[PDB]
Enzyme design. Structure first.
Site, PDB file in Angstrom:
ATOM      1  N   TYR A  56       5.568  -3.889   5.459  1.00  0.00           N
ATOM      2  CA  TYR A  56       5.344  -5.079   6.299  1.00  0.00           C
ATOM      3  C   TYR A  56       6.284  -5.183   7.492  1.00  0.00           C
ATOM      4  CZ  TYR A  56       1.663  -6.611   3.237  1.00  0.00           C
ATOM      5  OH  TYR A  56       0.459  -6.705   2.570  1.00  0.00           O
TER       6      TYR A  56
ATOM      7  N   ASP B  27       2.483   1.745  -4.114  1.00  0.00           N
ATOM      8  CA  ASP B  27       1.517   1.481  -5.207  1.00  0.00           C
ATOM      9  C   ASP B  27       1.511   2.527  -6.305  1.00  0.00           C
ATOM     10  OD1 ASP B  27       0.179  -1.114  -4.013  1.00  0.00           O
ATOM     11  OD2 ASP B  27       0.071   0.421  -2.448  1.00  0.00           O
TER      12      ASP B  27
ATOM     13  N   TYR C 161      -4.390  -6.240  -3.341  1.00  0.00           N
ATOM     14  CA  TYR C 161      -5.185  -5.216  -2.662  1.00  0.00           C
ATOM     15  C   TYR C 161      -5.903  -4.217  -3.530  1.00  0.00           C
TER      16      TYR C 161
ATOM     17  N   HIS D 220       1.117  -5.204   8.997  1.00  0.00           N
ATOM     18  CA  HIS D 220       1.599  -4.149   8.075  1.00  0.00           C
ATOM     19  C   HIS D 220       0.847  -2.869   8.344  1.00  0.00           C
ATOM     20  CE1 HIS D 220      -1.858  -6.164   6.493  1.00  0.00           C
ATOM     21  NE2 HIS D 220      -2.183  -5.048   5.886  1.00  0.00           N
TER      22      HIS D 220
ATOM     23  N   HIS E 234      -1.089   0.781   6.461  1.00  0.00           N
ATOM     24  CA  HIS E 234      -1.565   1.345   5.176  1.00  0.00           C
ATOM     25  C   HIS E 234      -1.301   2.825   5.342  1.00  0.00           C
ATOM     26  CE1 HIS E 234      -3.387  -2.255   3.484  1.00  0.00           C
ATOM     27  NE2 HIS E 234      -3.702  -2.529   4.731  1.00  0.00           N
TER      28      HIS E 234
ATOM     29  N   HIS F 267      -2.571  -2.401  10.441  1.00  0.00           N
ATOM     30  CA  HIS F 267      -3.388  -3.559  10.200  1.00  0.00           C
ATOM     31  C   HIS F 267      -2.919  -4.803  10.884  1.00  0.00           C
ATOM     32  CE1 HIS F 267      -5.798  -6.011   7.034  1.00  0.00           C
ATOM     33  NE2 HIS F 267      -6.084  -6.323   8.278  1.00  0.00           N
TER      34      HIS F 267
HETATM   35 CU   LIG Z   1      -4.009  -4.397   5.277  1.00  0.00          CU
END
Ligand SMILES: [Cu+2]
Ligand SMILES: [Ca+2]
Ligand SMILES: [Ca+2]
Ligand SMILES: [Ca+2]
Ligand SMILES: [Ca+2]
Ligand SMILES: [Cu+2]
Lengths: 723, 720
Positions: B365, B379, B462, B520, B522, B685
């Site tokens: 972020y 993740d 998410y 943020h 990805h 994003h």
């Molecule tokens: Cu996103």
């Protein structure tokens, strides 16, 4: 008195026919009609509705027999609701066959008409934007007569006439000095005959080893403009001719006769010059691409079915699908045109796009040799992509659930030509629309459906597929695929181990013995007249940037956005950085959060071949000079009715930029005004053996996404509660 | 004698039942079986073949009845050839439930095993690559006992053990100094429990407008490493906790309690610090994403059917489809692993890829504030994406013609967990494979089919979708989709015309009243051990260039290619220019034309959100420093058995790069050697209102294409 054999009849009508021995049932599929019929039954099922038959299907010697009326009773029944009749005709409807014949009658009645005149284009001359939007949104009739644009070639001259179809009269006749005309289909024949009769030409071929010079196939190429260095007069109607040898394998493209160029004068119907280079032996090995020497693998069937009819309705040329409404028409130059596109936002039809279509395209080569240096195809501008539409092969070119539309255009003699299966409309499953599996909770998932409008155009050796993709959530996608046969060069090397291999492969890969696929680019340009919730828009830039943290804490940097308006056409012509955001906004309308309603423009959303960064030419090259649209990915111009081709109206032998270079030259203000977006995208094609003898389809993607256009996820559904 | 009710029974077994009243026929669909049966018929059709029924289907009160033996007689008849039995097990088959239990038994028998020990991972310890390729290519048996890697978390201590499953013995026990373990599932519950039982916490929440602190939902986040600038001690097993208000809309994510962070010590099970910022009122408006407040528009049906069965065969975990053969297995950390991938080129199976999988991913972020500055999700690494696989919703998450596979992994207590519908295998129509409409000739067109292997994992808010796509022509695609709920910041601004608006949206868009979607990125990384027609490969660059014309004639320039070898790992680590060509070539083998057989590597083949050009961090950032994989799109390293994760084996509070930064540090030679390709790809994003309250799926694409691997169009077919 009779009946007719079912499978003969249906196959002839174009229906797919399945017989289920165990259920004793026929399944018949044709466009929007999914029909079930059992031999002997008195009813048939059409899209879930029962239809009474006069005469049941009769089974015999394993032969089913149907009435001579069957097709009309079933297919023309009215139970198939896909197609509807228009009561109030759309102002942008293309010219009907009747209207085409009328327009030709009016110019032919003109004192100036000569018998040899050919029609390069016959097209609607549309009403003003403002009137068309009022029809589409307020159902306000257009009180303007239907006018046609009639463009003719008289020898080597171009004349532009305007006809009033309402009042039956010629409104203007105007020769266009300077302009050269595009290539017409009869030029293909003409060039072939000229070579056929040429004494000199046969001599030359014989010298390159061809005995029977009757087996030689020509292909016409435009010559471009080299400021006289090519040694060709600007005045004359010329074409360059490349030749291939027919070896009977169905692929003459695999047998180039290298370093032999004939220059033909079309008005004079003679070979004016024969440029010859070193003799390179013609690759003789047979290379059919049609499967004649191959075994086809067994693939189990896969069917996509819509047993209750389609989610879209086609009324005239208008398509209604979920929240979208749009008009679809056909042009002989650029193919399909998508107009008056609205999105029904809870009852309010919001403007999205006045009109969108291919702008133009170019396929330039990078080899300097005699048979290559001038080679650059302007597929739509020079050859008429609409005219060369390739009929969709049901189930291969489009999925089994598509609806195929016939379209009418005028041929070069001014006679209406119906193209069968010209456009494919189909819905497809495209993964989950959205999903969220909250730990310990029931799953939330919805399916995504896309509406695809597909058109295929074949220009010589190469085939192009264009898809216009409507997403239920407001996104619009535009994809371009390329397949077909490569333009190859005859070379002496068999393998990379041969003495001439390094020189032979300087401008392309060795893809077969004695065959090189010359490096080239595929550059597409799309003209999109977006009216984001109204005509007056502004161009906004949003650049994601790393900035120092000035707020304290352990972080040294932050993720911020650099936002600014792009005020004039010169600043708006630019290279596209896919790490950035470019929006067309409506400064006058805001969403619920106070943000301007916008659309995000993405000229590069990916592709399967290396991307084209710009024109792969030095800036001192003439082609480079003539076609500035090729080097920038994003262009935004102020709306002007006649500005429609990126490459200019008459690109044949043009000497400067009459396209996008010209439209942006006057550098008008883009501040809260009617803007036109032009997206350029393409690839750099470096060949490999896998694309030989036929090239697997390669794709490029572009996208338009709503950006604060809506107030929340557009596919959530209707509000059960409140106002 | 006696029957059961078809619909109840069939629906319970997972079959789709369709009744056609006009035809008086039932169509039954389940994975690979497409069945047709008429009430009272003595036979049925299974994938186009007839089967004799013991007992016919009987129609009651317009209620069909089936024998008790119906499912087994029909579905287990052997006419559905989709699944075949594996007589000789592939050496990479994942541990079975039995093997998982045996492995836990062996470590539990040790005097060193402490009683509250948890398992971070229990996974196969594979044989050597050489043995595994010999099995797949020559059916040479691997005579090595099955071994398991057992990784345990003892308090905050990591221990690695190796067990011999055949001999039932502990081969090694290795405490791992300094490593921190990943987040385990029980950690979610501790955190909630700890917060709820805290006095100080409740007091802090009361301050922010919350009367009833029982309605507070927590979420655990890893804290990263700031060299003590965050004021956290490195020894300790810490987690930071963010909180939301439950307002009963089923969407706690839409109700942030901004500027309140609680640091929890999990060994001590106590809040060790509460960090508070300015009071921002909690967004209270109900924002369900589940449809409770909506009515969807009616849609006509669409069905995809394969009435004669599938073109693929699944034998054990091996998939055979057209010219491809590959092995599919599941891992608790990274999910699916695709192995021993060969292409049958006219009867000769040629090596393509030894192993491919997700390597790792990160969602960092860009806000410096108290509740955001350390926020970065690893993740797979910190949470275990295989463990968090989300069962596919048939017909929605995957098309109606898919086959859904179940997969087993160990949970954190050492017990086998079977994940239902963990993976989907489906064939799809993908336009014409090729076409040429020669003027005045009959058309030549062929249909393109793609085989997709789809897997979904959800971590917190998410949801990620991964597709491994096999093309008939030899191309392999890897697509990554993102959907779910965005992580939002509570702010005072309602609209952009509010006083605080400018400050409120410095780091993200206002996507709802009082809600900002923080910017943020990805970033996905894929580990691909390609063995292009053999192990010894080289990395070749081919850069398209404009060069002056030296051949004469009117052109000033030409299109040429600058071709060169990239010889070491430091030179292979690079930014990817989509205008260039990058190949993994076999210098030892050539096609018919004398060109080295190769595969073209494309880390960026497109996407629907703006591209990640690299890490959107300054190079002095700790996160930047720890995770080198984020900033270059292509990495090529020399093959080593334990180099598997881009972010390092133990990324929780790592102090340095133990991933790709380390693997490429020794700068080995890449010349005609066994290489591993790593592809980093991603997005930046920046949010919009259309992604609120739930985000429509956004996708990124990558591609691997044969490049002079074959001698001609691979889809033409076999020569007659
Ligand atoms: Cu996103
Ligand atoms: Ca406009
Ligand atoms: Ca202008
Ligand atoms: Ca390798
Ligand atoms: Ca290394
Ligand atoms: Cu090409």
């Amino acid at each position: 008195a009779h009946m007719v054999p079912m499978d003969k009849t249906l196959k002839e009508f174009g229906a797919d026919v399945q017989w289920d021995d165990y259920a004793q049932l026929f399944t018949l599929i044709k466009d929007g009609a999914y029909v079930k019929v059992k031999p002997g039954a008195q009813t048939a099922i059409v899209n879930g509705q029962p239809l009474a038959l006069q005469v049941p299907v009769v089974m015999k010697d394993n032969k089913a027999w149907v009435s001579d009326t069957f097709i009309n009773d079933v297919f023309q029944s009215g139970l198939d609701q896909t197609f509807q009749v228009e009561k109030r005709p759309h102002p942008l409807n293309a010219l009907t066959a009747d209207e085409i014949k009328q327009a030709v009658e009016i110019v032919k009645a003109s004192a100036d008409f000569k018998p040899n005149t050919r029609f390069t284009e016959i097209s609607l001359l549309p009403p003003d934007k403002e009137a068309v939007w009022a029809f589409a949104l307020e159902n306000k009739p257009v009180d303007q007569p239907r006018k046609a644009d009639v463009i003719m070639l008289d020898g080597k001259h171009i004349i532009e006439a305007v006809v009033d179809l309402q009042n039956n009269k010629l409104l203007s006749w105007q020769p266009i000095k300077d302009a050269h005309g595009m290539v017409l289909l009869d030029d293909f024949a003409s060039v072939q005959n000229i070579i056929n009769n040429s004494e000199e030409f046969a001599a030359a071929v014989k010298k390159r080893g061809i005995t029977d010079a009757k087996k030689v196939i020509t292909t016409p190429l435009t010559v471009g403009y080299f400021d006289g260095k090519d040694g060709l007069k600007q005045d004359a109607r010329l074409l360059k001719v490349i030749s291939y040898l027919d070896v009977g394998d169905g692929n003459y493209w695999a047998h180039p006769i290298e370093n032999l160029v004939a220059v033909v004068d079309l008005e004079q119907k003679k070979i004016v010059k024969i440029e010859e280079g070193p003799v390179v032996p013609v690759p003789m090995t047979a290379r059919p691409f049609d499967g004649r020497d191959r075994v086809a693998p067994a693939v189990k069937p896969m069917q996509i079915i819509e047993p209750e009819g389609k989610n879209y309705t086609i009324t005239g040329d208008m398509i209604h699908w979920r929240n979208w409404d749009f008009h679809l028409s056909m042009n002989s130059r650029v193919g399909p045109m998508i107009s008056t596109v609205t999105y029904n936002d809870n009852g309010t039809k919001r403007k999205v796009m006045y009109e969108g279509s291919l702008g133009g395209m170019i396929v330039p080569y990078g080899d300097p040799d005699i048979g290559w240096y001038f080679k650059a195809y302007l597929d739509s501008g020079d050859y008429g992509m609409g005219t060369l539409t390739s009929p969709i092969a049901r189930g291969k070119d489009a999925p089994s659930n598509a609806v195929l539309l016939n379209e009418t255009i005028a041929d070069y003699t001014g006679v209406p030509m119906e193209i069968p299966r010209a456009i494919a409309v189909f819905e497809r499953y495209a993964g989950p629309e959205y999903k969220h599996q909250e730990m310990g909770q029931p799953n939330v998932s919805t399916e995504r459906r896309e509406l695809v409008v597909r058109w295929i155009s074949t220009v010589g050796n190469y085939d192009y597929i264009f898809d216009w993709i409507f997403h239920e959530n407001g996104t619009i996608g535009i994809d371009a695929g390329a397949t077909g046969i490569e333009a190859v060069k005859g070379v002496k090397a068999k393998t990379m181990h041969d003495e001439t291999a390094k020189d032979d492969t300087r401008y392309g890969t060795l893809i077969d013995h004695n065959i090189v696929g010359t490096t080239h680019q595929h550059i597409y340009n799309f003209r999109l007249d977006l009216d984001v919730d109204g005509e007056n828009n502004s161009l906004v830039a949003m650049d994601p940037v790393v900035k120092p943290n000035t707020a304290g804490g352990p972080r040294t940097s932050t993720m911020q956005v650099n936002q600014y308006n792009i005020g004039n056409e010169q600043d708006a012509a630019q290279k596209f950085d896919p790490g950035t955001i470019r929006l067309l906004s409506n400064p006058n309308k805001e969403n619920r959060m106070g943000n301007p309603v916008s659309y995000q423009i993405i000229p590069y959303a990916g592709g399967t071949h290396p991307v084209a960064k710009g024109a792969q030419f030095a800036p001192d090259e003439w082609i480079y000079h003539r076609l500035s649209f090729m080097d920038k990915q994003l262009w935004v111009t102020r709306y002007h009715p006649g500005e429609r081709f990126p490459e200019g109206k008459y690109p044949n032998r043009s000497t400067h930029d009459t396209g996008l270079g010209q439209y942006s030259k006057d550098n008008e203000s883009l501040d809260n005004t009617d803007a036109v977006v032009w997206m350029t995208t393409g690839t750099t094609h470096v060949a490999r053996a896998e694309e030989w003898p036929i090239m697997p389809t390669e794709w490029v993607h572009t996208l338009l996404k709503p950006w604060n256009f809506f107030d929340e996820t557009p596919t959530l559904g209707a509000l059960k509660k409140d106002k």
